[model samples]
Target chain A: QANLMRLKSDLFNRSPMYPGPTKDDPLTVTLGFTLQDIVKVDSSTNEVDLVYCEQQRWKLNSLMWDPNEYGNITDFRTSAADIWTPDITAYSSTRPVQVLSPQIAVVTHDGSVMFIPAQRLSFMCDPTGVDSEEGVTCAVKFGSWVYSGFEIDLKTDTDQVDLSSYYASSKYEILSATQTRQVQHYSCCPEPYIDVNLVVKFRER
Target chain B: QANLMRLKSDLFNRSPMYPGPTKDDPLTVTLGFTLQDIVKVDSSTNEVDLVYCEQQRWKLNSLMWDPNEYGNITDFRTSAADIWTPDITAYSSTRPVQVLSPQIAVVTHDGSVMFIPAQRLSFMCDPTGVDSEEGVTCAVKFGSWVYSGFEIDLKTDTDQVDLSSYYASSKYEILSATQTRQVQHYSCCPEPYIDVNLVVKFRER
Candidate 1:
């Protein structure tokens, strides 16, 4: 009788528990927003739009091609300063200051705004190699990356070394302005998607 | 009978209701403070200690002198910039950058530090116009200053007009670097004050 009662309770709450449309178990795939949605390409600046977008697409395409790449996502939104030289002043002042990488704005059903950082998300679904249905689903989870500081002493000037190794040393290294990092969704429960509509007409005050 | 029952319920919750330390009544006297606590004097700069201190004391003295002063206080805490020009090279590269003005470090009961901005505090208590006991109390409040943008049309080189009228136009004018707006206490209950101690010793590892 106790086993039957437990099954009955789960049946009633199943819809409320797994409300995401992607799959019955959406926690298996973590998804992130596309780069086109987050940043406006600066035409006057260096070829970031072309070179950076191609690089991001190539990595994401390769990940989707392999079914085993299920834990992380590419195109995680990062600060522009991490990618570009500080000399560029093309960003609009009207936008809120971007601080951390892989951050996304969550507009809830009631119109409240919240932020989801890279540390809180992960990939949960396997990318299908199909043509029309090549997309994968992602869900939120509770996970974080640990970071520590260290100094590297250059013993000799003649030694050939890739300085990028030091940049990649920290797991939570800030994403470059032109590059995106793989992201995961970390919320325990699935978030509901709500569509909004509005109509406005300007009149003399 | 219903009114009596409502009154009895309120009597039990009176401690929760009147949680702050202000008199149920508002005081009709204004108050101010002399800058003796928050600043350290640098001998190299002009002696703002004499002129600025006298100016602050004179204003506060008159507010208490005439029993007619009421409502709020002015000229709270101005920075020491009036006496010394900022040296850009003096700031250490290792320390975190200070971004906001009138920011203070608050030590809480838990031994954690918090930063409080001037926007969140104001003067509340009335000055008790006595020689040794002429002091005022300040508390945190939800009140905020309002600001609006405006464009001033430059008419001519020597326009004869009192500019003080424009100064008084806005109720929430941003304080100058050398000015500290009067602060107030707003919490229903008095916060428990805590002091911290620090010690250090050198030993071979």
Candidate 2:
């Protein structure tokens, strides 16, 4: 596991040294989070900070914008405004990665601009108990945030009709979670058909 | 070749006998054209009506909708008002098919009501010298209607940038056909892309 730390100096959100732009330097970006602020690898403790930081490092790389020509300042936040948020959560044997931040942007206005940041649902799988012979039993928890003024709308009628038809076709079955609609005030037109929104669990021999 | 005829009664457009809806019979639709009226299997005839009519027959089947339990007439013309017109031409071993009919719907408001009448494009393929072992050589002609009253406002800059990038990628190539734009009065918002409005011709190796 410590060998994972030695994978590369640039692997854990910390490039050994990225010099600030000189007159000769091609226009490049300086991202948030430095080596001193990032989490370090320690095998003695069961903390998987290395895995978590690696995930974040890649995310920051994509978040940073590139210019068509060199020597131009591209603002990361404004450049990524219309782009959809990248998934940053990970489920690992060591520990679950928990991220509670906005992936989807919700815009609002009150003369002045405001935003309701989209809530993230986080999860982690536990690796304990039995070995390969007895098989392992893992546990997970769902973590999500809901705004105070937001609402959840459920679709019961036409969706259930489609769900039952899907069940009759023998391809899928509904899981423990109820597949309902999430109310949002954005769209070009009213959606006509019910979408398969439920999380489904299936297995094959 | 005759076995193609005996494949099934449902193989061709015509049925052996279809009694009109009566007091004893359930409600039925009388479709246009019959197998007898369709193009026959002939190697000498350059008319590929068999392939063309078969395409039309299947389209008629879908165009002829059945009533639901609610007992409401679902008119195909109104239902397919938004749908792009189906291509009713075909290609054969000897030659290609030609057709001239309205396909795309052009709706106009007449103070009290809406009217949808479409115009069509016609085409034909040529076959001169071709062999079974070596394959066939074919050529085609594009026949379409362009109204003088209709205006075509093309997206000049941004669309060309996207188009050039698309051309840089080898998936598509511009053909000999002049790519023009067509004006339509329908849209919720101004579209930001240029669409080629001319017929294109390409061949496979």
Candidate 3:
């Protein structure tokens, strides 16, 4: 346990400005989402409220450890605020992503870092035909708030949505869900940026 | 200059989360203002707009260097955003602190860090008597936005205001300027916080 302290101090006792494996390398972050519940679907505003868990995986190039050096412990948990986190938000979000819980980031000896935070988020989506046989589709676009594709490489952890612990909604049946990655250039940002889009189709019973 | 790069890489290549010289120590930051011009004084809203330079000095506990090792270099310059900065703002500001320029931080070998940023800020004040014989007293309260006194100790760089390069105002005559520090317990914050108040008195010319 004392060696664990030594490992953390050695890794975190310096500046949090290093972004990746090297000064010139772009930091790659994998973003994923697990839908917990479909709280509401509004046809008037064309918005969808959801309770879900958001996960981000990255590598702290400045950090590396050996399991044998820390009593064979493979991983440890620390507060998410203890280190620099790439700023990411939903561009399609109509309202603030209300944080439901604080996250404890897990770090492995191999320098892999994982952060999971559950939240209630609202996104703009069309539910016009949710009550009919045609069904409805919604997309939630998530991307970095500041970093461009040149600085941060964003991707999805999986193309298929994880529904392992989903709480079924009474009125809507999810037909299919897919995650896709894209790179876009904006006149305002002056650089290309990566976004991971989540598209979900649902039919009303 | 190779040693200078070495010094910065050694200092800035770590986590910026370290706020003080030690875990149990409070990072003492000295705040000061250099008044350049009083742009406007609105009696209707009791607001004063001023263009000034804001300066803050603190110590980086985890950083130290030897002048001999760095080839007699006493100090070095880096971007202000490279390290952890205490979140400080004007509590009485009616509008955002309009940033005038980006700042380059000057760090000494002894870990002393100095940052000077010029800005235009507005503050609520009693500008009622600016056109009368009686002088008006306007105070600008500056304090940390998040950290309490336990984490960051705020202090005034000097008891008297620095007007070394003051541009005399045509409508008002400067009376006196003084800075005072206070620690108040806010119910919302659940802890004692520090604030530095700058009071400026002026009379009609």
Candidate 4:
């Protein structure tokens, strides 16, 4: 009771805004999408629907505190809306990006934040060979719509996009996956646009 | 002719300097190295010498001007030393870091600088799979030495390291390459240090 109350009054009660830790610093988000299921591959509309366990890892130094000072509470679970979340959106998509659930996040004594928001998105893709034995490839790029490369740096691990969690669709066999980060600058805009794109080539068996 | 002369005299007349333009804001450099060739891989010393085209794209707001004032030349070429260059170095390399050449940089009227230096560097690596059919992998991490992540934000394009320009080497065959960006905060330093690493796994074909 003491620990819970103390933690609640100290951190759970205080509000944090969306701005990064410092003014000059760009909060780098380690992002990755793990395929959970292939919902639909519609050929007529030229769209591919997917559900991904999207994970974004970042650090917030303000969230760091000694465990002993907080009644030995090493970590705590809180609502996703309580803390800062990146405004990342799919740059090329049919429908707007949306979170599947208002998930609870576990914040440790250290400043590391691991946020996995299961998201469902439908992106434009060439659905021609999706039904054929020799699959077609479709690339969907994602990044911050508002923030430039300087504000929000979107990155990932060694592998681009992971299909290990892929719940195999009986009709399709996953052939290959390619993920890449693109930096682009427009004629009018001063800041560059950074994006991480995913290409999945799969075929209907 | 008048506009062209004005553009050239305004920029080309200046002496070379090493510092970036901004003081308050961090200079963001879109950094990437396109692999050219594997010059040599010495197993005894576990060293890999590489020939690459290193590209660093950045913006200098101070360098901006009206393009129509220069008759829409749109771009100009100048010595790399005339503009600011990041102190990027391979943290894991065996040799001391130095500039490759007094190479030319293409500067757009928008102050976008694309500097490509044809470079040859030999770095320490773990050579384990040269003879084996399935090759072993080694990663080389590169970033700034003195400046913190807040001062110099190192970035990249699509691949961590591009193999599109990769020339076939008789000594080693390129199998797979992986790239990732890392943000590291050390206990001694107040600011974070950002790094882009490349992992190349290959064998002798």
Candidate 5:
């Protein structure tokens, strides 16, 4: 009882219904296109979704702890002064210029060689407490302490406090030497190294 | 004669010698240590030695190819309108906000996370052909052209044309979103997650 229903099907061929390249070779030619076409899709009816994703753990190089607990160092000072005293000296040329406390170092994954100062960095995982066990520990060993996951402060790249803070406040111990050595791979096996001049900013709680 | 000599020696010892305290006793009851005594011993002898330490490679984190190739997001704009339009919906409230590109995800790692505009960031790498191994290859995955790693007339944080000239421009692009998640980790990782806002900044170079 089925008939050859062949009425005028104009809606199917309307331009707005399918405003695209001619249906040349219709079935044989699957739309040859690029990602640019994705932009044309309407959001209300048909949607092309995009989400804000987070960067993974292996990509971070630095992080911030409580800056209040450990004081901040401002601006970049030449590591020409000695750690024992702020006096610039040819005798003391082995220390990082500045140091950050709440102790921070560059963040990196296992086995990678990179630039000095690691001002730009990401961490494999957060340090301290439980997060410490999640991934490998990487650090920049200087003097008696080590710092890892160090990120720079974008808010205060230039400062007017450090040069005077050394003498004005006894809380900040002034050093006589600027040249100090950085030790790497302290807790790991077959460790490599990178030496850089940095600022050490710290405060005891 | 021998007996007379022995008698004289015994008399001298009893007349001049004095009893000394035991080793366990305090020094005050014994030699009574003084600075004058030590100074008289040696004024020219070296007290401590000084030396220069060589630099080392401190491997912090590895630049993952997956993330490195994906660092940066090209800012979408409406040439017809000078403002941004984000597609919002009930589904977005339930799930993560979708991003057009992975490069857009890396805006968090660009340091100036708070200040760097989403539009200014883009996927880019070495354009100088300096290190052939990891330069343009990393750029192509995210950008159609190689990034000179330089920009020009640094007007706004997100202007692409402002990123043209090397000395007078900005070249580095956000290649990963690791830093944005980092801000979340820093602000929320505490035992009672503190609402901490991170602002990262860097120089034009």
Candidate 6:
């Protein structure tokens, strides 16, 4: 058996690296899935059909955002935000790699701002997870002082249906860890589906 | 509409020009099917059930790899070998923006080798469109030369089934436009599901 640090880094997370800007530093990765029929190797007899008879081949791909030549948008928080759901390929590659959790931006009425780490949910929002009341209270703050970036009112529905299923409200505002004077309020209610509110403050440049 | 020369730049396919080394290009693209739901977007109706709607998105994700990154006999093909079907989402941000259409590539044979385009459909053994004959006759040719350039294969299967659904000996080849030299070949049967074969050549230096 191995130690805890080894388990966390090598076994659990797989120590995935961040994506780079250029092709040489391209976002190269391999994803393993339980349900997908990609075979890692072949050594079957009857029932099982081994597709990946050889070693697993990582699919090459990337996502690009040119800061100089960006699409029309000043503030992401206020723009008609679109939620990003991983496609089948992206989803397949994300077995052990999870996105870094976000921290709350704390602020008071006077104009000072601070960021505090917010508790993260082990898995996605499931109705049968540890009760929210029993868990730590995770909240964010926003006021007039902190700078306002873009807000993405992402809709989290499949293409087979309409976009209205996950359209967050158009109300955009600054968000932080603590509440201050002149706080903006927003509300969103999607029909026949659940809703998830995700807020992120742009990392300092 | 606009009538102008569309510069054929290999921004997506060519080697990682700026940030990376090796090139990443698309030799072929196939259009697959997807399902959808119905919905109605009205404010006054609060407790309404639902109606119907369709959705689409873009597929511009890039990934890269290095030389002998894995082991000997390294092969990088365009089509994904992993046969993973997708779950239907009501709405998705990364939807298929354009229908999968004809794509291009370059091939070479060591000593007077017959190059085969990856677009020839074996099942299209039956006559209909340009793919009326058995093989792509004399589409293009190159003698003892480094076929280190590119070519286009516009084969589409409007009424095609899975390659596994056909016969084991099922195969198709395309010859040069004038000579009987085979330029491309695809061999697979439809038993389980239709699969895609991505055209690949030497490492882009």
Chain A (alone) TM-scores for all candidate structures: 0.14, 0.20, 0.89, 0.89, 0.16, 0.14
lDDT tens readout by residue for model 1, A93-119: 111123344433322222122332321
Residue A185 lDDT (model 4): 89
- Report the lDDT tens digits of candidate 3 across residue range A1-205: 7877877777787544443222135578898888777788866445578787888898865656787867787888888877667666765454546788786898888888898889887766767778877688788778765456765788896898776767864467777777789987756446687888988888777
Higher-DockQ candidate among 1 and 5?
1
Tens-digit per-residue lDDT, A1-205, candidate 2? 2332232222325422221111222121111111111122222211213111111111123223233322342222221233322211111112223333443332111111112222222211111212233333222211111100111112223222122222233321222222233333325334222112322222111
lDDT of 5 at A12: 20
On TM-score, the candidate that comes out on top is 3
TM-score, each model? Answer: 0.17, 0.18, 0.51, 0.48, 0.14, 0.18
* DockQ for each model: 0.02, 0.00, 0.02, 0.01, 0.01, 0.03
Best by lDDT: 3
Please state the error at residue B166 of candidate 3 in Å. 47
* lDDT minimum window of 10 residues, candidate 1 chain B: B49-58
- Lowest summed lDDT window (length 10), candidate 2 chain B: B29-38
Candidates ranked, most accurate by DockQ first: 6, 3, 1, 4, 5, 2
TM-score of 4: 0.48
| B134-160 per-residue lDDT for model 6 (tens digits) | 322111111111011121122224322
Per-residue lDDT of model 3, residues B76-185, tens digit only? 55667767676878998997776653445667778888887667688998787677766888888888887778888888867887776344422456677777888898
Backbone clashes under 3 angstroms, per model:
40, 0, 7, 0, 81, 70
Q: Which ten residues in a row have the lowest lDDT in candidate 5 chain B?
A: B29-38
lDDT of 5 by residue, B81-147 (tens): 1111111111001121222222221212221111111211111121233223332211111100100
Between candidates 3 and 5, the one scoring higher on TM-score is 3
Model 5 misplaced stretches (Cα beyond 4 Å): A1-205, B1-161, B167-205
Task: Please say which candidate is ahead in DockQ: 2 or 4.
Answer: 4
What residue pairs clash in candidate 3, if any at all? A14-B14, A14-B15, A15-B14, A15-B15, A16-B14, A16-B15, A16-B16
Report the CAPRI category for model 3. incorrect
Which of the two, 5 or 6, has more TM-score?
A: 6
Question: What is the Å distance of residue A144 in model 4 from its true position?
Answer: 1.1
Question: For model 4, what is the alpha-carbon lDDT of residue A26?
Answer: 61
